[PDB]
Amino acid sequence: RVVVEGVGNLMHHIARCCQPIPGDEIVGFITQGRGISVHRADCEQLAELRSHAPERIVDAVWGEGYSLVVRVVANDRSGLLRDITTILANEKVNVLGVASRSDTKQQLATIDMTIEIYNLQVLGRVLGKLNQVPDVIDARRLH
Amino acid sequence: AKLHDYYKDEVVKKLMTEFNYNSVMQVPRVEKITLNMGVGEAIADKKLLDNAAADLAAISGQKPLITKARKSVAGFKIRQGYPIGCKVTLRGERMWEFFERLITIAVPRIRDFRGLSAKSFDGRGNYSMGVREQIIFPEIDYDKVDRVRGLDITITTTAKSDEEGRALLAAFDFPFR
């Protein structure tokens, strides 16, 4: 699967403060237990990890790429978000988790939805169909 | 009063070198040792507090000052005015004699001894510790305690910088891991 520098099969755990996908490649941190800690290549949190122990880290790629989180943002509400529901059906990958954050300090209408992807290409069209809706002032992979 | 005499000589002498004080009064000096003991179980059995009074009387060599609850608080379901913890403010000749009696014999008897925290300071250098088993004091017959009333001690100092405090305490040897 993941060709951790010239060898695959190696047990690893994906990081939960970032969402690596088959793109920039991934930095691999060796945790005490649970073997490898893939944290994607280049990331601030990843940065502190290197900061305390660079020696126990080597790169990894993708060998032969699923599950990711995205933060879409909408205008307040009064229903057009229901419009988003309608889109639920058009979205191919089954939504994994609803997470609206309308809180913050203002009338902001953000939603941290969790889903998946089969190929980076497909992802491209994902952002496309998110950008179309006017109420979707924002739509990007949350990290 | 031995180490008090010691103070008057080697202690001031000593510190004056490390602290180049303009004048002798500038050297810190232990002011008052305070044996606090908050049993807080008299609210259950008053005589138990009396036993605590026995212990402090057995250590200070003088009658303990029985503090009363300052505030009625449900967190302990105790109301203001109730005896809560006995104490002693021994100072002077007494405090020196006790002090010696402290570092020389009391402290060593402390099970699994491992120095003392250097971090125990109010910033004013007034050191504080807390023995867990009052029995380490010779006067206690050991067998005669029906409880293990640990207590705590506050070595109030005229020192301002807690570091000066460390130094002063250092003159009297002291642990300090």
């Binding site: 005490q32 237990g33 | 008897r109 402390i110 099970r111 699994d112 001894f113 491992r114 050991y142």
Partner: protein, 114 residues
């Protein structure tokens, strides 16, 4: 009637009296009295202090109480920190040696309560 910073028993035949000390079983205890030359029968009360001190110097040879506790705390620590299987078991509050876990192992797992 106090050695190793603790030991305050009596009436007991010295060896048992010493067994009271954390860090010493009967064997090591007997060994102590052996080198001390003290007869095991003697109740600690009968025991002369001029002998008790010899016993202190005697027990000094054998790691006890305080250091022992810290020491074991350190070995177990190493375990749980290193991530060795034993460590995992200790972190899980479970039998380490390899005992049945599907049924008994109440000691480690504590009461049947959960």
């Amino acid at each position: 009637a106090r050695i190793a910073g603790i030991n305050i028993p009596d009436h007991k035949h010295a060896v048992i009296a010493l067994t009271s000390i954390y860090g010493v079983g009967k064997t090591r205890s007997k060994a102590i009295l052996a080198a001390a030359g003290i007869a095991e029968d003697v109740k600690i009360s009968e025991l002369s202090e001029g002998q008790i001190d010899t016993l202190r110097d005697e027990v000094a040879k054998f790691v006890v109480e305080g250091d022992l506790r810290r020491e074991i705390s350190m070995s177990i620590k190493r375990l749980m920190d290193l991530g060795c299987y034993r460590g995992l078991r200790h972190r899980r509050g479970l039998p380490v040696r390899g005992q049945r876990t599907k049924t008994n192992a109440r000691t480690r797992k504590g009461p049947r309560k959960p």
